[PDB]
Amino acid sequence: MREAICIHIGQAGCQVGNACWELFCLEHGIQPDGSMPSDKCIGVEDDAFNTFFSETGAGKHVPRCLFLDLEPTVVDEVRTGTYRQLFNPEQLVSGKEDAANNYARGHYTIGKEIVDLALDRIRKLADNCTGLQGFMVFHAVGGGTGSGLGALLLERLSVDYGKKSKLGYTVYPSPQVSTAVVEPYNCVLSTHSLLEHTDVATMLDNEAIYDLTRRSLDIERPSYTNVNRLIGQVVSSLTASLRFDGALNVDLTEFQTNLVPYPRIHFVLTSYAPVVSAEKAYHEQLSVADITNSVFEPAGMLTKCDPRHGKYMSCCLMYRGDVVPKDVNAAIATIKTKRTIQFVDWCPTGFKCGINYQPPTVVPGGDLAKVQRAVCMIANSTAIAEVFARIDHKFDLMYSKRAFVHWYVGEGMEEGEFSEAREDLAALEKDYEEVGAES
């Protein structure tokens, strides 16, 4: 068992899923056609692909994934792409008219009429499933379908699956770079769903990914392809503990306990190292201590947040490859002893460690340089309220003149919704800073 159901919503979520699945196929040996080499004896057979792929009578290895987009463009291009015979013709839902970066339209008018069969497909996946570890959602709250429709799906999943774990990777608007102008509206309106119907939320804004790619990964023209590849790498690193063997195997509900101290407190930071190119890959020493230091560098997170502008609460480190407990303990000790990184006074340990024997894989033409050892970070820290501060300031600038609100009003949303989301986000940031407040 130990399988999780992946859900991808919006152009951004669909491309995240495309990168994740092209990584997982190479991770487990499934070819783009959907077939992987198999044994003859029934006793000896690995099921490391069970977490992501479900076997079929015809030998196919269908991913345990759903794609959902109101705009048919991305899903149709996937249907015409390389993995056409990999991805199921169903569970690849297509709409007819997009949300047009409108949370109200994606949550009340157009999201309503497609979420109905979205739950049908998700529950079909769950019925095929037998050991569900959780739901594995990828989207961007910047737009309409990613925010409104993703939200709607989140509360329907919560109401029809009880306390099943949900891991939501959301591409928040960056502090200073964003595609849309109503993007702050969409993000703020989605904050409620990300707060109430998301057990753990991960921040994946594009600003930090672009800067990390330019600085360490050393690319002139970072693109959505590269950022989705990085997101796929971080997702694979997080799930590799239950995917493969390791000295300290950790499961989804296993590290949720060590990551989330309070139910309202679950929006966590993420980082990956060594995220380096071939240029520095054979010039800088990549030991366990060095990769841990690079992880805890406050310029290396996939989210552009400064841990020094807050204080850590719980760091979960997914070590993979050459890693050994005797070195990860020393890395934890040196992280503790250096004072540029602080923890809350009420969490003395503050560290969860999971060691996996599988070194991370790469992709053809991979921007990541292949390394024998790596480590991922999932950190709950009080500094995450700062990106919420940025986004609500954008929202306040937008909403002072009540601009771009007529679309939401005409798509069936009350104006008071903006207010409700505003005090909800304010309460969230207050709760964060109060968690970080000294006793």
Binding site: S94, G95, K96, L117
Partner: peptide, 20 residues
Amino acid sequence: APPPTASTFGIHGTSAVVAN
């Protein structure tokens, strides 16, 4: 009497692939 469920008729011209 509720409308028919999972109906493919009446969706033409509307942004719905299924009807209710």
